[PDB]
Symmetry: D3
């Protein structure tokens, strides 16, 4: 009756059918405390799980860890317990010169640079969000006063070569990814992160509602390693937006 990795039961969720799924286990309590009656449920591996209440309805907050594989486990196990809507929040690197640190991006579709999406649907299938979730995320971001961009997200199984970073141990990027950042830039792609392709393909092919919003922590036309100075303020804004987006999805 406890799910295998997350360590929670259906009763622990207290009726929740919506989950906010940040990446970092440390963001879980912060998100829960933006809501009412936050309650710690479990922590195992990269999965920290809280419940809280938003306009009187239970919401679960569960970290995913980095990457499609760990995200896919959390989504499956939460779905087993009745969760049907998944709101992903995370950090991201902008590809376009005009998208600045602190701006918010809402993904309209993901470039599938991952492996786990292929475990749910063949490559032809679109990694696209639920329209209601994407609409809620746009409205929450805009209502908050943020600068918001809607568009395509390149979603990579690596932080380093698949985002065409060269300041690395080998300084090498495999042929597939050489020139890839400028290719995505010329195609209008807004940003890089590491989970949206898996999450959106999995949910869109499995009857689950999902969307992604992310705060820009670096502009890749400038540099490869994000500055620490701006991380906390961008993170605070993103989680305020995602909780408001959850409020708009409650029925």
């Amino acid at each position: 009756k406890t799910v295998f990795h997350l360590g929670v039961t259906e009763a622990d969720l207290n009726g929740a059918t919506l989950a906010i799924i940040p990446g970092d286990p440390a963001r879980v309590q912060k998100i829960a405390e933006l809501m009412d009656n936050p309650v710690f449920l479990a922590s195992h591996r990269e999965y920290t799980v809280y419940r809280a209440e938003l306009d009187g309805q239970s919401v679960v907050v569960c970290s995913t860890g980095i990457g499609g594989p760990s995200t896919s486990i959390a989504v499956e196990e939460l779905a087993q317990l009745g969760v049907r809507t998944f709101l992903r929040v995370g950090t991201t690197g902008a590809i376009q010169p005009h998208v600045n640190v602190g701006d918010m991006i809402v993904t309209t579709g993901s470039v599938r640079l991952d492996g786990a999406s292929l475990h749910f649907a063949p490559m032809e299938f679109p990694a696209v969000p639920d329209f209601d979730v994407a609409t809620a995320m746009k409205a929450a971001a805009q209502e908050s006063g943020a600068t918001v961009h809607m568009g395509v997200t390149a979603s990579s199984d690596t932080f380093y070569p698949g985002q065409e970073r060269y300041d690395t141990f080998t300084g090498r990027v495999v042929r597939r990814f050489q020139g890839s950042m400028k290719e995505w830039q010329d195609m209008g792609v807004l940003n890089f992160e590491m989970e949206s392709a898996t999450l959106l393909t999995m949910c869109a092919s499995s009857g689950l509602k999902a969307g992604c919003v992310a705060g820009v922590i670096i502009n890749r036309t400038q540099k490869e390693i994000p500055d620490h100075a701006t991380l906390k303020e961008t993170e605070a804004r993103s989680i305020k937006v995602v909780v408001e987006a959850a409020r708009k999805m409650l029925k």
Copy 2:
């Protein structure tokens, strides 16, 4: 300059930056006449081109023919002549039992079962619409009184084997497509058509805004025959909806 296939010049379009692109040449005049001052511009091969005025702004109506290849020529040549927004309309058959004849579908992403999309972006890239166009299409469709479905469309380079039809000369479907209709049904795909993967991938990777709307006229899962009045109503409603969606994009 006159573009190679469409036979029109930039001056012929009178400043239009938006095009409505049906598949059937005979539907071009029917769409144009819902607007002010429709004028025939050209007809060559499958490309019949009219200009009209909507709220005082010039709009193009141009047929695409069947399939991504002929669609890709029309979109490119119109873009050479200043068009930046492309609204695809038609009627369609559904593959989900809950979708009824006369309902509308607004595509949120396409399964790329085509070839021409690969001439613009590798298969990983999402065949997704511009979010403003999809939003305007949803609103216009709802305001028509129709029941509207937002969701994924399977976009095939064939009418017969790629839609898993067996009632054919050979009665065979190649390995790739055996079992495919049930596969898409179980992944929540709403419908089949033959152009959206090429159109959406081309435009999303080229800085052009695109979307697709279709009224439903048949359903692979419901064996009954719809009434003539309903099919006539659905055709009329689809084109009223696309023109109202264009009005929302120009505003």
Copy 3:
């Protein structure tokens, strides 16, 4: 009894088992009038259909539109009505310096740069003409007095990026097609067009005889512009050649 797109019945074809399939609906009547007793049968979308008599035998002439998708519908529906041999006549761009405007090309195999051929056979399968049809087309083309080239044709789902054209709205070509025209030139490929890969693969995997012949309307390597008179003669010779090739196929 009436096929879904072409609008004709088996009886309308008066026993024809051979069709000549140009791309452009306006060339159908021209081809039919080179034969005896031409009869208009139907026009719907890009499909204009005539019948005529050649040495006392019925022959269908049916346009395909541009691209594999629209071609695949016409071939299927004609095969449902008893047609077994398909002769494709069409325009092409030569990419070899020794091939001049006005020469003929008879395709011995196609580079499958399309999507619809994969709806009939996996990529490993050769896009190959029927040997009797290719033999008949070579003989007809040579007997006309034309200079005739037998060889490989690159068959693309786009006119622009898949033929490595840069004079376009974006001026970009996706990675797959960058450098591709020089690649095909160095591999001895003669020309680009947009339907032979689908046609030849579909027919060679479905028990239908097919072949393709084309007059060269431009050479991608020559800066000189062809005479209006030269293009006119080339158009006329191409259709006289395909009718002669049809004569040689009748049994």
Copy 4:
């Protein structure tokens, strides 16, 4: 002097370590480190808990990877930036062959690349294989512990559920690519499923880094019996004793 972005440590923090033991679970990091001398906590950020210890007088890092190739690839790269050149993966696992019993140990000789991150280092043709010295040391350490040791191929999946052909799930569906896959791997002699070795081995073998994987079997997909609690606890303890003894063999 830089601190690497995800792990939050500097080169000086590692005290000269050129070998890392990389379990998946952050809670297992301290448990491995305490088998060595002078264990010290360095950092914990996200799924990455980092300790340093000393083995026969040499510095060794212990750093968790999280689940899956993506988070693993970050840890390996950032440790390599700080001088680490040898990576010893440890963990427990479930087998797909009837002759491999719970509590047995598997040393991977190559991985089926059912992941995505391996493709960010080398095209699919490239073999996901371990360094031969690491695999040799892992085999010897596993045998010296008294365990039954199997050398062979591991299927390394980006999912726990469909990519391991599990049907007891929310949708109950497995995509076409993975339908029949478990039987296919069983008939090809594959030993086990796990979720990180394809990425780890391909990344390292293509980047001048020495890597290997050793695991304890925590389930056998073909057996009805359920292992007892003592057996599972013994297998956990044995797997980390084994990887520390394999490290000792690599340092000498």
Copy 5:
């Protein structure tokens, strides 16, 4: 002045030959050469036995390829460095259509590329098709010999066993890719299986060389998997008479 790496012959050794007949079995080389005038042994190294001869006063090379695209690609390349521009393949084959009889001939109009070496010359989209004049010469030579000749598509496999969907093997298994493949090709109208035409035709058609393939049917897969030796000599004698007359038509 060069001696090619594998064939062990120089351009002077070929006495001006621009046409080669390329059987697979080295023992067939002398048999083909003796159907022509003034045959001379040139070299034998590995699976490559090379003779020259004269046909209608013109020099002709005969060189074995061995089995498979890789060894064929070496012989074709090295002969092309020494001036050969036309390559006539003769070999044996298994029919996959019930009406084709043992002893019939097949002239390939295009090959299903079930090989790997063709991809070393052109991507998979490129058609494995013969030169039209060679195919035409082979059809006419085959008809004129009295044989029953079929023109059509050939499935060209890198293996004799699983890629031809044979089950009478050590494991009895066929990998997923090839399960059902023989019936799939049969329903697509494919005539036969062999092992070199995909590589040869793709290499040549993408390299400015003229090539074609003719093969004698030694088995029909409607009946059995292992060919009978009974009529093998008869089929082989007819096949080589045909290929020499096809060469005569190409020189004319």
Copy 6:
């Protein structure tokens, strides 16, 4: 019992052998057999020359493969039908790393699958890896001989020319897939090129057969010096002494 179709031998002809040494060149078969006791010629057909000998009182087969995965796959299959379970490949190789000299030996720990026949046994994700016992025996035999021995990844190509990125050819062209590929493999630490290991190791690892590859370096693609005849002859002799000693270590 039956005579296998290509090799032309029966189970009784092998006198109980369950281990085969499989060189590439048919002329090397007798030389290997004569390093053992009581060598007996069994058959020669096409590229397949087959001998039997005795090693420490046990029957061993020696069978050539020809060049390439396709002809290798036939020999391994037919030997397996006759009871062979362990296959020791010896062959020549071109090194691509500057540190690997002519006369050194390479023992493959995994192959880059630049072939087609491996895909007839397992999908591309599957690793082309050796049996751990065979690789261990080859390393020991090679090191005990006094040779300098390298363990690592081998690029296994269906061509000698474009798939090894040679431009010194009739067209001077290398298809897009292989342009830049030698530097890519060099930077990924790949040791050498040959033409059979991917097929052999994938086939065997997915079919319950034990296989490994050892190779003598006959050229280095990064070196301008040409090796002298004496060095080449010594390398040839050492490679077959090594493979015989590795067989000795595999006998039970």
